[PDB]
Design a binder for these strands. Structure first.
Ligand SMILES: O=[N+]([O-])c1ccc2c(ccn2[C@H]2C[C@H](O)[C@@H](COP(=O)(O)OP(=O)(O)OP(=O)(O)O)O2)c1
Ligand SMILES: O=[N+]([O-])c1ccc2c(ccn2[C@H]2C[C@H](O)[C@@H](COP(=O)(O)OP(=O)(O)OP(=O)(O)O)O2)c1
Length: 848
DNA sequence: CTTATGACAGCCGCG
DNA sequence: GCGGCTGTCATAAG
């Protein structure tokens, strides 16, 4: 079969590559690769090579890679463009693999591992690695085996060997419930000391060296730990053998609160599964712990255990190991579902990049564009440095805070790529400039037509509509491929078909990101602004077009139909369209959902396309790619007192949705956005009730809402203390910690954290509050034994019995209810023009 | 990343 | 004792 790369690395004048050969064998080669870069030349010099601007270029072959780099520096000094691909690994891959790469994952060693490190003094810092590794579970995808490394004697105790037999049994039988599917795939290896285990693991590693190395938190915990441990114990010469090319680099990552270290294992591609998940799941999760994610994904989670993990090895080593196995298998189970690694393998081979560069839209697009330009002898521009400079972005209408009985929303598809394509925005496409009228003038087609020669954007930009721009071409090609591969979604292969289609979608949605990123070879401020400013007029123009149409239809005049617009959406108030027929004519809920759907399809969408073809002519664009789809139809169930929907402000609304782009729901479902019910900081029991409140407001009406309040409020004190405790994340605890006490500016949760410490001071048993970790918070009644307004303890857990009974006694229900339930509700009912209790004076609603 | 809201913390000005 | 305000910190959804 066809050859394919595995990992590629540049070291000095060499390029080191692991690859699969003609006969499926994994192997390594060192190549003294000669790069070509390109300079500009006079018309005199005749060449096949031109830059994107059609300017002639000379191909400079270099004897070695350092030459090429030294040349880029020399060229930088003179002040002349050094164009071509500066990242020689990409160039090497483009040269070596000059075809559509077809890979076979059965020949790619994917490893999932986790370690366990008994640490009795807090989280074992990986860069310090000061505690013995007492378990490694390492899964090899080729052998389909779980290789379990068990330390039997540590500083923290001696233990019996782990039992597969006991592991297989049910929890009720004293078992660990390690699944049947993996019980015959475990290879158990106990060790008498830690050096014996680490050197046996290190051999194992050379024998079965990961191409893709993954798992949950490997890049931040497991890899740094193993590395520093081996390193500290055996010296760096030994730890480096953990890379196939024996080169490793320590890298520091700065962030919000501080910096961090990762080990770059040259010749391996590390795809931490936590990072694959956060990147490609597209579901903002309240927690990213393997336990929570595995629960959300598989309805099962990580193995359960009594007491702290720090005592588990001593207390129940049997479980401790089994828990190490289950956690590695959890990741595998999630990947069996979401397919992220396969999706990474697809993208990486499609772009011809190092697989790990799937985390970089920059690196991916750059390599994709470079290749297609290479195929036509074109020379990519030098990556110039650019001052990071904020430009305007998405437009968001101020909603008038109200209730909205019938709402119908619409959506522009793939707005930003669409605009790039519609206008022809690209570096080499810039054709000039035009005198900008205020954006409002363009919105109302009142400004003078920008140009009738060039494709225009309301930010003053003008583009050639005669040339086919590099970027719009590349984004058009990815669109066309999507269709193609989602056309084989008519025909085992309904797998490679999905991942191709999903990955084209990922590239499409990631392009604008890159184009706004200053380290993009094709970044251009004038252009990025052109995209966002065009989008800003697209949306408001169509807000105008929609109002005009519906006013004309309804015989109304100057009636605000479009109630809200967020980035690529418009939400349309369909009250009057309903009134045209009249409510009593509809027989059931489904009958008016029928009516609206029909009206949008037959009357609005034609008026919308009609409206956008006008904009296209006004701006003089290359082609018309502005297409809207009807998203939601929302309202109260027929013959009910329910309000249907409400907006409390920008990105703050609830809708009672009946139909999402064609799909008609059985029961109605609440689309809630921005409101406290969608907030992780909101207590469990309260999240549940605000949602009930919103359910009752939209579907049932005021008297129902009021009934639930009076009831929930009567019944608050009996709810579990953990369910009514608000969550928060603790950051810079020390930064506000002045001798155990809240210094200037100390935020509410951190104050609570210190109050806990004050009651914790001098306790081992007590679970300490980790800096950068989620914390429960609870208000305390005035004059309490902890001497503060609040207390805050670690989340996901019950509070220590050393203070628990005094917390429960002193916690301020009144201040808790008002702060977490009532105030947010008053929020919603105020907007929806509703009362959550009777006899509320009408006069509150005024600024008297 | 940016667009945007909310919980709180001092600060200010007020007989 | 407190509303109007600028600021830090949290979280949301593209
Ligand atoms: O488009 N391609 O398919 C393509 C384009 C360029 C390619 C290759 C394969 C190599 N190169 C480039 C990269 C090198 O700098 C130069 C010569 O490549 P080579 O493999 O012929 O190396 P030589 O130095 O000639 O030695 P070799 O012939 O023994 O490998 O040409 C393939
Ligand atoms: O988005 N921009 O970056 C932007 C947008 C508009 C811009 C400029 C710079 C000028 N304009 C406006 C204001 C000018 O009156 C008009 C004409 O553009 P131009 O480039 O023709 O400017 P001139 O100085 O007239 O150039 P010329 O006399 O060489 O044609 O375009 C830049």
């Amino acid at each position: 079969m066809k050859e394919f790369y595995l990992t590629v690395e540049q070291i000095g004048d060499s390029i080191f590559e692991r690859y699969i050969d003609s006969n499926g064998r994994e192997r390594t080669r060192e190549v003294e690769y000669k790069p070509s870069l390109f300079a500009h030349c006079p018309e005199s010099q005749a060449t096949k090579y031109f830059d994107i601007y059609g300017k002639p270029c000379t191909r400079k072959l270099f004897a070695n890679m350092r030459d090429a780099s030294q040349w880029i520096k020399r060229m930088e000094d003179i002040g002349l463009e050094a164009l071509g691909m500066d990242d020689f690994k990409l160039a090497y891959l483009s040269d070596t693999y000059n075809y559509e790469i077809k890979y076979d994952h059965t020949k790619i060693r994917v490893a999932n591992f986790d370690i366990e490190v008994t640490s009795p003094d807090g989280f074992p810092e990986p860069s310090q690695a000061k505690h013995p590794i007492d378990a490694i579970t390492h899964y090899d995808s080729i052998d389909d085996r779980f290789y379990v490394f068990d330390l039997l004697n540590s500083p923290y105790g001696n233990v019996e060997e782990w039992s597969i037999e006991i592991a297989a049994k049910l929890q009720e039988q004293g078992g660990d419930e390690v699944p049947s599917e993996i019980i015959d795939k475990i290879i158990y290896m106990p060790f008498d000391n830690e050096k014996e285990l680490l050197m046996e693991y290190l051999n194992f590693w050379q024998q079965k060296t990961p191409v893709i190395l993954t798992g949950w938190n490997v890049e931040s915990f497991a890899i740094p730990y193993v590395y520093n441990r081996i390193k500290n114990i055996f010296g760096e010469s030994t730890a480096k053998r953990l890379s196939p090319h024996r080169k490793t680099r320590v890298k520091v990552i700065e962030n919000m609160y501080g910096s961090r270290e990762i080990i770059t294992l040259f010749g391996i591609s590390v795809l931490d599964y936590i990072d694959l998940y956060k990147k490609f799941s597209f579901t903002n999760q309240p927690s990213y712990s393997l336990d929570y994610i595995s629960e959300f994904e598989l309805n099962v989670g990580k193995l359960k255990y009594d007491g702290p993990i720090s005592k588990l090895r001593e207390s129940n080593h049997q479980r401790y190991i089994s828990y190490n196995i289950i956690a590695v298998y959890r990741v595998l189970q999630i990947d069996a579902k979401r397919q992220f690694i396969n999706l990474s393998l697809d993208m990486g081979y499609y772009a011809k990049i190092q697989i790990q560069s799937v985390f970089s839209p920059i690196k991916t697009w750059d390599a994709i564009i470079f290749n297609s330009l290479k195929e036509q002898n074109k020379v990519i521009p030098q990556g110039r440095s650019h001052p990071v400079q904020p430009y305007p972005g998405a437009f968001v209408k101020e909603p008038i805070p109200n209730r909205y009985k019938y709402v119908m929303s619409f959506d522009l598809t793939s707005l930003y790529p669409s605009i790039i394509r519609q206008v022809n925005i690209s570096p080499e496409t810039i054709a000039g400039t035009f005198k900008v009228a205020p954006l409002h003038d363009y919105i109302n087609a009142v400004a003078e037509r920008p140009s009738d020669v060039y494709s225009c954007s309301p930010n003053g930009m003008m583009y050639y509509k005669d040339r086919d721009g590099v970027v719009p071409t590349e984004i058009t090609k990815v669109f066309n491929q999507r269709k193609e591969h989602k056309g084989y979604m008519l025909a085992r292969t309904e797998v490679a078909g999905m991942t191709a289609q999903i990955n084209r979608k990922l590239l499409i949605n990631s392009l604008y990101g890159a184009l706004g990123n200053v380290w993009f070879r094709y970044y251009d401020l004038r252009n990025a602004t052109a995209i966002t400013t065009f989008g800003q007029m697209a949306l408001q123009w169509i807000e105008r077009k929609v109002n005009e149409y519906l006013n004309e239809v309804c015989g109304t005049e100057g009636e605000a139909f479009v109630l809200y617009g967020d980035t690529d959406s418009i939400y349309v108030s369909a009250d009057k369209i309903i009134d045209k027929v009249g409510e009593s004519k509809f027989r059931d809920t489904n009958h008016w959902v029928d009516f609206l759907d029909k009206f949008a399809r037959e009357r609005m969408e034609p008026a919308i396309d009609r409206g956008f073809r006008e904009m296209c002519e006004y701006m003089n664009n290359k082609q018309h790619l502005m297409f809207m789809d009807r998203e939601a139809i929302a309202g109260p169930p027929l013959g009910s007192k329910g309000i249907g929907g409400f907006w409390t402000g920008k990105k703050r609304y609830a809708l009672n949705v009946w139909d999402m782009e064609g799909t008609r729901y059985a029961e109605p479902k609440l689309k809630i956005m921005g409101l406290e019910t969608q907030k992780s900081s909101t207590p469990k029991a309260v999240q549940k009730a605000l949602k009930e409140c919103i359910r009752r407001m939209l579907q049932e009406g005021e008297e129902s809402l009021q009934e639930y309040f009076k009831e929930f409020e009567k019944e608050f004190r009996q709810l579990n203390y953990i369910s009514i405790a608000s969550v928060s994340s603790a950051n810079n605890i020390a930064k506000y910690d002045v001798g155990g006490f809240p210094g200037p500016k100390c935020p509410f949760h951190i104050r609570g954290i210190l109050t806990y410490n004050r009651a914790i001071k001098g306790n081992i048993d007590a679970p300490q509050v980790v800096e950068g970790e989620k914390v429960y918070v609870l208000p305390l009644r005035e004059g309490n034994p902890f001497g503060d307004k609040c207390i805050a303890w670690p989340s996901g857990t019950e509070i220590t019995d050393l203070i628990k009974d005094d917390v429960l006694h002193w916690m301020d229900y009144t201040v808790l209810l008002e702060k977490t339930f009532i105030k947010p509700l008053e929020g919603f009912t105020s907007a929806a023009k509703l009362d959550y209790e009777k006899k509320a004076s009408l006069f509150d609603m005024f600024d008297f």
